[PDB]
Fold Tyrosine phenol-lyase.
Amino acid sequence: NYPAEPFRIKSVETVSMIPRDERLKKMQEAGYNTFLLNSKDIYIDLLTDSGTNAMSDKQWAGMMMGDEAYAGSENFYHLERTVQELFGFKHIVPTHQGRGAENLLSQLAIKPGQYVAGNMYFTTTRYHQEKNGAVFVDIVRDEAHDAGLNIAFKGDIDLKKLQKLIDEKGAENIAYICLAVTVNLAGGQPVSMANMRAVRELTAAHGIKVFYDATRCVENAYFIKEQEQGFENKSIAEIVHEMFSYADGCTMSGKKDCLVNIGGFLCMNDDEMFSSAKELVVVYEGMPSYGGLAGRDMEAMAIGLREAMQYEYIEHRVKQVRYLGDKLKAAGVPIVEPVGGHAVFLDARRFCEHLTQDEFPAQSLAASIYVETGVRSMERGIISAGRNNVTGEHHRPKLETVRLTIPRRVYTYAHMDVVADGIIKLYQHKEDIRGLKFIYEPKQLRAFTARFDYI
Amino acid sequence: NYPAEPFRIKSVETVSMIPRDERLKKMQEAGYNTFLLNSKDIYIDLLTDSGTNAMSDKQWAGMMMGDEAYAGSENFYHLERTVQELFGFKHIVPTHQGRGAENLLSQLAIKPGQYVAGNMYFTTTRYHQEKNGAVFVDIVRDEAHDAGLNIAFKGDIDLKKLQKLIDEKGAENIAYICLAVTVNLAGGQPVSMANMRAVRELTAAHGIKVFYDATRCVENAYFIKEQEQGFENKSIAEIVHEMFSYADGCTMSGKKDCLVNIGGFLCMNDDEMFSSAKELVVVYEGMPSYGGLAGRDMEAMAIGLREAMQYEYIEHRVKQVRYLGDKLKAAGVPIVEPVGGHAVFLDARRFCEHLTQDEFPAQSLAASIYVETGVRSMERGIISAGRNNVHHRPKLETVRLTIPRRVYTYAHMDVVADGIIKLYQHKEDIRGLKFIYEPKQLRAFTARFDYI
Amino acid sequence: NYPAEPFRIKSVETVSMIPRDERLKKMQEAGYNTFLLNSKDIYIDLLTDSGTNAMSDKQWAGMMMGDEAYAGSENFYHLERTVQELFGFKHIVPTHQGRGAENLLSQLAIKPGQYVAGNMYFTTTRYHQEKNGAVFVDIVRDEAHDAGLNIAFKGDIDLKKLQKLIDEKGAENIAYICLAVTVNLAGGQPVSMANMRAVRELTAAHGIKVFYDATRCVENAYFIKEQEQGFENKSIAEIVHEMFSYADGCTMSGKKDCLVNIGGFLCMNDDEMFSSAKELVVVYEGMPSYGGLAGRDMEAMAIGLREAMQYEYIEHRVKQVRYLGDKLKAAGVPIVEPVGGHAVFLDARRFCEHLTQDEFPAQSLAASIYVETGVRSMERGIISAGRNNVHHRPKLETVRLTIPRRVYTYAHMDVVADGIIKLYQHKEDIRGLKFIYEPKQLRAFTARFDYI
Amino acid sequence: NYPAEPFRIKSVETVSMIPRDERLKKMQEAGYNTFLLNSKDIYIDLLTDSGTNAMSDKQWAGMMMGDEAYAGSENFYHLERTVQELFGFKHIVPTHQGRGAENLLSQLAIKPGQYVAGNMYFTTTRYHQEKNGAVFVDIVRDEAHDAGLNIAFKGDIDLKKLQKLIDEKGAENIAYICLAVTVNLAGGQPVSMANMRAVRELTAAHGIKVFYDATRCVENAYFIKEQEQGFENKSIAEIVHEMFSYADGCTMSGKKDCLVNIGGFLCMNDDEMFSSAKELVVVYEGMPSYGGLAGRDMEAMAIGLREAMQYEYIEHRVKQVRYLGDKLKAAGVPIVEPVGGHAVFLDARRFCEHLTQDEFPAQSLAASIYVETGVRSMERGIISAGRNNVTGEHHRPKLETVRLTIPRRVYTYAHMDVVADGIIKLYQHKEDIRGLKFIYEPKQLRAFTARFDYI
Ligand SMILES: CC1=C(O)/C(=C\N=C(/Cc2ccc(O)c(F)c2)C(=O)O)C(COP(=O)(O)O)=CN1
Ligand SMILES: CC1=C(O)/C(=C\N=C(/Cc2ccc(O)c(F)c2)C(=O)O)C(COP(=O)(O)O)=CN1
Ligand SMILES: CC1=C(O)/C(=C\N=C(/Cc2ccc(O)c(F)c2)C(=O)O)C(COP(=O)(O)O)=CN1
Ligand SMILES: CC1=C(O)/C(=C\N=C(/Cc2ccc(O)c(F)c2)C(=O)O)C(COP(=O)(O)O)=CN1
Ligand SMILES: [K+]
Ligand SMILES: [K+]
Ligand SMILES: [K+]
Ligand SMILES: [K+]
């Protein structure tokens, strides 16, 4: 079932164990917005798995060996050869994080008016595509839009949608296919190796490029080894290397599956695009030999990427998240299924049936979760959806969820029990959860700074 | 039930997940002596809680602020002021670890021929006492020698035994009383504040000194807050400060309850003895301003001692050990009771009743534990007792599962428990061992065995 | 004369002492382009002072206290409060380095077609201005373009040039004034407080904004305390705080005067622009609570900015650079004068007068410097200028010896000086180079050359 | 002449630049005893080269890889194989520092009544020898007792003194020969390889053991490569390995030439003595696999010992000390000659001719040095000599010196100029230096806690 941590604790991080009454005052000061809580006032911070990972002793040893030179740093050569060895790509350009690499790729591979198609989208990835004159097309399988359907590899590309897009618009008007592993918007759902092979075969026949969003590719590789027939004898590294053999490049956020707190990079095989990438990286990030990263951070990301290939680490990572999802599902708590690689999504629509969506149930549930447990979670519903600015009304998503995002190697099963036991107790008196109303609302991105109050 | 860790993991330590077949080869290469296993071949190392603790980010920040000066280091001033504030003693002398402080105290407070009495003994403490011409006398309560008797504060000194020693030998022939908190040999058993208060009252009436072995005094302070009536409203620091108010000094191994990997110190209130301590520390340890420790380590120990005062930390520390003991007891595994603050002791006498004591049951059980789970434990039976005469047979024949602080999780405890529980269901298959290396002095450290 | 380092060495960095014959092979392998040399093959790396600084023990202690949370990190609150205290600005937005802040400001304060005027330009700053539809206008004093003229505060804006721009184009067509302290392209030349005060008076009368390039503002503050009458009794922090009182905001590269290896930020007083900055930072850098930086790096930058305010540190920093410039000038080596705060610029035009500009004298001099001494320097002549049309010929043809902060000693400066002085005594032997790789965009970074 | 530092500064240590008037108040608070000054009030601390060294980035990387296990630590195996490789000894026992190893050796190789002979003595080494029932015999060459005689290898053993001791007392009554490299009491003077060969040849013919005090053996090895004919082509490691080939064991203080802040070890080739050494180390230091050291510190000492073998490091170390001595000698400042490997000794007798020794000129000179420059130095004269307690009078040494001890890789030539320029200015008005009188004097070891005042 659930394996113990395949590591020992080397060093601990001090936290404040403030009681419920103080936590309530902190939440009121934050305007009932978990995004406005201070880190020092949080016991278990499940806001995101991005850049919040715990590094290893080996990584911290590399942090002491930072070659901080502006050009020719040994740390960059270590990072370069590691990615070339594990991912198999020809050229590497480091960036300070994932959206820095997406900014580069979108300016290099998109002519204004072309289409970009992928298995759903991410906010920063789709922004840089649309800012550079592209029109996004969702070609994910229809099953990915059913929150309750428990099936494997929900993130697979629908080959029928891809075939019709090529026929309706033409291969010349398609910039590239953006295949994300895993699919964050669908709940961290993986993509099968068979799907990546079929996508590569169909795109190569029309000369269409394929670039991966490899942000959580290691979690995706474990799902292949666990659930895809024929990969039970292959190591995590062998699966990762085959995944990228069906891609012409990738954007990577090291802050996720590279087990670091900062860092990313951009990969490609084309020499001419790599030449243009080195010219553009100096504008936004830095030299091609550090790309907005300190030398010690390139070293940490190179070591972390190699550590992520260990089967026992990634098995425990995914199964720790699954443990939280299983404990909630066994108690009757409504969650999004299947459980993804990095987070558990509570269905706040069913959790707070007594509240309309205009009362922000996911935002109110997140506030109650913190006060009752000291756990910070992220609202992923109507507040994060924003406002259509042409009309001013709320964007209303089908998913009204609270995201419990698990950083890597930071928490234990006992911490997961604290999260579960508190949510389960809340669910047993879920009728007492009250709604919220705006008291402060910003112009753009309201999820980060809006303030509320009980109705 | 059992609280979650009152901290987050900041950094992790890489371990080798070698399978059982590899572990079997490793144990054979080590000659079935867990003391001879390589650290790199161990998943969960429960050999000792001494110096194996995980430090905090605050402590590691202090590690970057090491003032390595030979005299007048700010790190020493931080350590001195911390101990004076929390322990209440007047003078502090740092030592590289606990037995360095015992060497100093034993040469300063023992006249040849005098008696030293305490609630049981420890190997290093008793050696320096006997090396300096003292005869040890155990004045612990008799119940502390019964592994299965579940009573509170097993480490208390028997006041009747202390009164008889004063009458039979005279107060002039008693060097001092050595009160250890907790009592490691009895299984990490605590001493009540009433016992410390009663001991202070009896010794002061005869002019007899009292020095504490404060190695695990914070674990002792939690047991007082949990189980002694009247201390439920008092903080850990208040209890620690009151504990040492009944002592004339103490020896401390920071490698335990100070949450560090090296370090100790010696405390006292007497000015004249403190003067002699500073003259003797330069012979063995170093200057009184660092005492065999780097500046960064004095800083780490000062910060760790203050972190140990946090109620949530020390509550979780003790209850993680109790979780392992409860899970084993619920399956029928014979252990020493009650569970101490730092370790769970398997009763190898009852675990291997089908084996004679000359068959090294505790040593064979520890070897079997590693092969089955990759967990290293310490033999604490006849092998550790040794042979003065041509075997010493102690009443306690145990295997110690010693838990380092802030290093392992409940899931790691489940690995230990589930493997031992499976081993106990086939305890008839655990065979004895045979001597292969002469027991030169401390045989527990270097002896080799075999049976196949 | 020249003060000793106002600090001790805490830790050292290993270097490779390869002989001249090895360096000659390394330079040939690099194609005589210093930008292509490996760090491991360099003794003294004077390529840039950006991100190459040595941090303090205090900063490394903060590196252990990284609060890596996505929002509400204590490290961000420390950085924000530090900048608000020392710079006096109302709002802070962290960025991963300086050009990240310039990308934000250029999209927020530039309407397409407007003019941006400043005391010369920098490559990354001018790109983001021109990419956002601005036309750059240099309003620095004419003396700043003369490498040999030794006058104080060469970076001052010519108020007459600024007045003519306002009259010829109109204040409505001027986006803002970009005042850099110091002026990197002129050789690290400072700007006087009187000039900043006079600029603020003229721009405010027409409603024109003023934004600083504060990358080396601490070096600029020292020159004011040293050479501007009336500031001899004022501390570095007081001067820095007054400098920014004449600005509406600033872009800062922490990799320079904040004594860190990564990091920057964007400051402003206007609430509405700060709201737009937080919406745009999530697109390129990250959340406004970390802005593309790890928590430990925000903490390191906050501590480094406060360390930069120490008079003894910044005095030694500038005077170590001046020591290198004085030793070269005393031997007759042609340099840019006066010596700036962060680098010494060899005048390759005068150093290699026997060589034409199309022969790449600055590039060939930098290659010869490495082979003779193992010192890497940066070409800052026609190669860095590039070719828009089918070569750009700048008035300054220099080789930059850029000094990282707290990394090297006076003895390292003697190695640089003694080797260049020996090279200058045989400057007739320095030969030209020939293009081998097409100058695709920024040719200074990847072009290769040869002559034998 | 003097080479630049063969390294870059990776990190700096903050110091307080307090002015002269404040420094005077600090010195008065310290009772004019530099031993009582606070570290935070000192610019350049030349009190000792013991444990004050700056570590490298490689060492600090090892500090992140500490295997803190009680037995079988990988760090101990690294340290063990390093010493066996570089020193050539068969068995290694770590100790927390040098005097911990001397405590072990003195209890293992000395029967009560035997003699111990060596090239002068050190305080802690001679104490453990005499505490275990030995009688010390100085067999150094007579030239070592002339402070002004500038000759090479002053620390050599006088073979005539050794031959007469064997004849007058018998080989059975000689515990061992304690050969120290370098000789700290003579001013850091080295021992020639020819002397070590002759000592080994003479002792081996009588079955007498030889144990080295290798505390500063790397500095000693450089002097051999620089000044002993025939070793110009041999590396530092080759010279070190040959030095210990003439010894049966050694005591080592890693706090010196191992480039660490704590640590030591004990070496020997005899299996039976090593067996007894492991039994005795558990009493005083700890297990034979850590010996009173954290795992990270065994790793740092192993890395530092290997770093010390680099010719450029040790050449700069010795020549930085020589630079300070040369600048003082060129200005006419009286110093002890020749300059040793680790310190420059000012001749306070000639520096303060207007003061009698009962006025503590070396102590008063050290106080003036700090007030004028912010440099702490050590008194090495009548105060450190102590009091013959049978009579109560002062011990009066021939040497009345102030020791300027240089930690490794901590200071620059510009720091040496601060020391020199301040002492040179003091020497130009040396008649203004006043004497001191006891106001507080302890029973034993007065150099550490005594307080004074101007006469
Ligand atoms: C599948 C994919 C991502 O998941 C992703 C990031 N994810 C994080 C951070 C995040 C992003 C945007 C928000 O509004 C947000 F509140 C949190 C998250 O929490 O989900 C990026 C971007 O990579 P950078 O973050 O290294 O630039 C690219 N691709
Ligand atoms: C109550 C007390 C201790 O428990 C103790 C040590 N504890 C050890 C380490 C150990 C000691 C001796 C052994 O034969 C042994 F096999 C294990 C242990 O595992 O329990 C010391 C000594 O403190 P030092 O270790 O800091 O010097 C003093 N007092
Ligand atoms: C006055 C100013 C700078 O000097 C500066 C950078 N300085 C560099 C690095 C550099 C930059 C561009 C090059 O083509 C180059 F070859 C070297 C340098 O060496 O001088 C930046 C940008 O700050 P970022 O580097 O933190 O983004 C803004 N303003
Ligand atoms: C030739 C030799 C040494 O020089 C030596 C130490 N020397 C230091 C420290 C010191 C020693 C005694 C003092 O009263 C003193 F004030 C300073 C010094 O400053 O000279 C040791 C001892 O090695 P530990 O210091 O690692 O135990 C053994 N052998
Ligand atoms: K850097
Ligand atoms: K030290
Ligand atoms: K982070
Ligand atoms: K340890």
Notes: Residues 57-309 of chain C form a domain with the Aspartate Aminotransferase; domain 2 fold (CATH 3.40.640.10). The pocket of potassium ion (ligand 5) is lined by residues A 68, 294-295; C 51-52, 261-262 (CB under 6 Å). Chain C is about 40% helix and 15% strand.
